[PDB]
Amino acid sequence: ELSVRVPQLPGPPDTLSDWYNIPRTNLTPELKRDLQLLRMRDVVAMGKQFFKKDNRKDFVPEYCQVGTIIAGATDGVSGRLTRKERKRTIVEEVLSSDSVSKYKRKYHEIQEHKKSGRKGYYKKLMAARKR
Amino acid sequence: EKLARKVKAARKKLKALADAEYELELQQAKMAKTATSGGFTKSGRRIKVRERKR
Amino acid sequence: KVDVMIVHAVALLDELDKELNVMAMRVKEWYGWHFPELGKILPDNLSYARVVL
Amino acid sequence: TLTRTPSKKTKFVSIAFQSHNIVIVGCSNSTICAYDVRTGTMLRQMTLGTDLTGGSKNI
Amino acid sequence: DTHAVVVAPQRLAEIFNAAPAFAMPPIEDVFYQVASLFSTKP
Amino acid sequence: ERSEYRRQLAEYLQNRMKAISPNMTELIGALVGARLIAHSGSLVNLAKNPGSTIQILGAEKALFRALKTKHATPKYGIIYHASLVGQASGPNKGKIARQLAAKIALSVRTDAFEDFPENADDETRAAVGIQARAKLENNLRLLEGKPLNKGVALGPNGI
Amino acid sequence: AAERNEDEFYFGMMSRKGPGSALTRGKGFTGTVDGDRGNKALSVETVRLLKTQDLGYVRTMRNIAAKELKELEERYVLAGPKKI
Amino acid sequence: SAAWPKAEDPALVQELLDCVQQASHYRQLKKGANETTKSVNRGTSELVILAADTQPLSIVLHIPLICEEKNVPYVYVPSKVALGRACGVSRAVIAVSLTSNEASDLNSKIRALRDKVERLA
Amino acid sequence: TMERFRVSPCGRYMALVASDKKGGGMLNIINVGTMQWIAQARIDGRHGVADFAWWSDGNGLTIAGRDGQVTEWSMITRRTVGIWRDEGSIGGTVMALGGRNGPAELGGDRWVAIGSNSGILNVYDRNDLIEIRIKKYPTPTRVFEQLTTSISVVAFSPDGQLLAFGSQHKKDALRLVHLPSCTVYRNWPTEQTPLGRVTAIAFSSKSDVLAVGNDVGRVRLWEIRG
Amino acid sequence: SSLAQQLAQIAANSRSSFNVKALKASHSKSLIWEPRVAVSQTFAEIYSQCYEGFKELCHLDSRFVPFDATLFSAQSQEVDRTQMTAEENAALDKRVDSFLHLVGSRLRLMPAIKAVEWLIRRFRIHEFNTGTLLATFLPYHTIPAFVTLLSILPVQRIPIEYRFLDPYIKSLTPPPRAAIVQQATNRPDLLSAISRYTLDSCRAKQEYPGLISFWGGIMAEAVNGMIDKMRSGRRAIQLENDHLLLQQIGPVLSEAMVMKDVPGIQIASYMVVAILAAKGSLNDNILTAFMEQLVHGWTVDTLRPGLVCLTMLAQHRSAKQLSGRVAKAVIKVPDLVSSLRDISKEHQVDKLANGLVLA
């Protein structure tokens, strides 16, 4: 009823009291990747959507949890992913979607226009000279 | 012929990884906390210490 | 002494613990409609079945 | 087979029997091996030196 | 003739370390176990 | 009735574990060796495996995670939910897990390969595991009662 | 560089290399002050830890390689004074 | 005894433990029962030696089944103190495993010694 | 050669080892005052004679040959009393024999010292060697793992109390043993005890003086005060 | 900072609290409950709970009625130790130590430690009688009550002998016997203080088996370690070290060799002097002197073990004869040759028998 107690005396908070225990986010590389994706989500929807310019110098929130969209009771015929469609990481999902062709084409384009005339062109001029 | 080429490459793979296993064991020897014989130095002297790990 | 009965019995232990707990939560929701404070105060499921009996 | 010599270079050259179950065999690599016949086991070995008569160091 | 007995202090302290201070064998039997560890009999 | 069925089922399995491996059940726990044989497939199967592998049964997903990325390697398996490791702390827990695994190997090979004249009692059948239990209990108490580290005790002037 | 003073004093000069000259540096000298590239003398105990980990990886790869090799050699046989 | 393919011949055992000393200087060698089992399960096993002097035999009577299933030579030699003290470990060894390499004079000796165990067989 | 030899304690018999190893050691017993061949003993081993010593009487003796085989041999029977194995020693290099109040039929000496090429020191009681029948596999009275390399020289005290032993490959491998407790003396020698790479160890006659000698040419002396 | 160190020495010597926070802190340092309630605890309900425990303890044992009169009263409510003069405090301290020796047996129980709680939270015993309280709970070095005592001691108040727990008071964990005894080895004065406590316990006849068993383990491994260093190899050094050792162990070993009322401490003294004989190469006169006091002091329940001790003593003796009164009391021994055969079944009594027949 009354016993001897235990003495147990041996930083910033870790689970936010005023948001129902959101733990401090572990820094894992795939999580970093997902965060980079969600910041750069503008260019992902290349051409068809635009986004609110979320602009901090950092991008990592201190508190976030990766989760799952569960179920649509009113609609699950096409708002439900197929078994093949389900992905572990959001980055692998947006990979496994379409249009990465158009991504690659834009990539070759921008790469060329930054390889406009900087050094390779000067070398080939130098060959046309020394010949 | 195709399967034979595949076996040749596979045996190369086995031999290389094996030599790697030998290298790792002998490294554990060379940096072990006590004296222990084994392998060569860079000059080719095959290491031999009759002293026993007590 | 043979092991086939052993492997089957331990598989039984695994699946029995599974469906045990799921029927535990199930009957908790079942009687909680008539009496939730039981699930609120007593969490132990065997005793829960005992008291709803 | 009771037992064979461990070496591949030993020839069994002379046989005798000290007891009913103890067999003594002189053998090419300067040995006389003593076996017991029951479980084919090896009691002992006797040795013979080099022939200090010169070469041919097998007795 | 005789001389002194060498013995492991590990043995001795373990002989006391089989149990806490209370809930022990009686003092005489403990003492007997001591002396028997300290016997110079063959 | 289901819960009572599980209860008598566990009592059954305790009787049967006492029957199958006296060293193992006297050492580590019947449900414990039940988990081990469950991963094993058979008792000869488990006695084929070396002791550190016994220590790393079950957690193989984490094992090959670590082995593929050169992470730190996971420290044990079902041995955690075994009892005898329960009383230690950290590094103590790890060391007792290793040595415990070595004796587990020895004891399970004993139980699966030592023949007995069938007028052989359970205690002379399990004396191996009892030896292991006593010796590892003394090992636990010594590793725990490692004396701490002293220091220069100061006065109020630091003196 | 025409208004340096020769007896400056810092603390960097207690913690960087110096440029110097061709005199002490050699063929390979611009007057850059180097730093690290990032890696240091990594002391022995951690190196042992590294070696054990690399050993584990290489052995397990030998495991998968040997299983694959035996399977392939078996299939090679099944593809392709003997009879008395 | 279950120790059937037994080599107690002193000439053979002395050649054997001499090769073991060679393996402990050349580090082609796995010492300890679990290490031997690791070697044979990983299939690097060229030859397996165990001593008869084990206090229980059944603690090491699990390997020759695996040696049978994996087609390797193995042999019993007398004393654990002998096996340890030739390995240069100064402890009781009850199981040693000597593995093959690509090319070695030690490899040649191992092939010779497995030929000798095959002769006893 | 004339390399190894031992003279009886009674000063009567000289045994010289042979340069013919070939499966087993052999050696010749010599009447010393006449300097003549009087006997020969030969044991079956692998590389011939490791070391050897008479008993306390000077009538029988002991061969240790490599692989650790020890053979007792009496003169009145002019044959080998028997064979046993130094336990687990893969190859011996040194042996010595001493003591009193042992088995008188085996020479009344109490202790046998065996030093093996691994570097372990096996010490036994000959009263425990008895079964005139012999334990083929005797048990160690005391086994000594306190030096790494092969022991170089070992020696008994005259009185039968002290046992000095050392290896020569290491710097100053020498420790000291009390009989019959058969343990080391944990307080000598220090690291800065100037022994040297030890080569020779002699007790005095009266067992008060220790003489040791390294491989450099510098012998040093100690008082053994009890 | 000279004057700073000097004022620090004074601040160590400070006892009664003189500013509000320090008052609150030493007021809240307690045993049973937590400090957050302890601060909003006042003496009254404290006196209630501890008096319930005290009546339970006085119902267990009769001998608590003197402190029922003097230390557990409605006036023992109000009396504050800090406000009276040194002789009053000395008498009070003696009353404390007497109660501690009275209470040391029934230690592991709730009403007794409630009494302990009254001792602290009224009489500041943790501050004023650190040594005797610390020794009297010291033999319980694996229980959480002792852990909590270690939690609420003041560090600069722990005795110089007792300052070994400092790693544990930095990190709360029950220290083990190896630590206490290692301090006993290379710290004689710990042994000195614990010897003094336990001999006071047997002199006030309040010895108890847990105490004496602890003290046996303590002295045995202690003097074992003491010889385990004291063997040096240098001749007069080992003689002189044995001298200093004997001077340290003298009073306690004599009081325990002839402690006539307490057979357990007789057995423990037998233990320590037996190890003193068999390990240490002591001189024959000192050995026979041990024999003589043991002869002087044994009883019949202690008879056979004391015979084992004399087997040790004469067996490690070097001369062949015994000195008189030893032979007198061995004639007084009832079952001599039967007991002697029983002990020589495992103990080699030959030198004892030889010295007997010579005498």
Curated annotation (Swiss-Prot), chain B:
Q: Where is this region: Disordered?
A: 33-54
Basic residues: compositionally biased ranges: 43-54
Q: Where in the cell is it found?
A: Nucleus, Nucleolus
Task: Give the protein family.
Answer: Belongs to the UTP11 family.
Q: What does this protein do?
A: Involved in nucleolar processing of pre-18S ribosomal RNA.
- Describe the protein's quaternary organization and the partners it interacts with: Component of the ribosomal small subunit (SSU) processome composed of at least 40 protein subunits and snoRNA U3. Interacts with snoRNA U3.
Instruction: Write down what this protein is called.
Output: U3 small nucleolar RNA-associated protein 11
The species this protein belongs to is: Chaetomium thermophilum (strain DSM 1495 / CBS 144.50 / IMI 039719)
Q: What is the lineage of its organism?
A: Eukaryota, Fungi, Dikarya, Ascomycota, Pezizomycotina
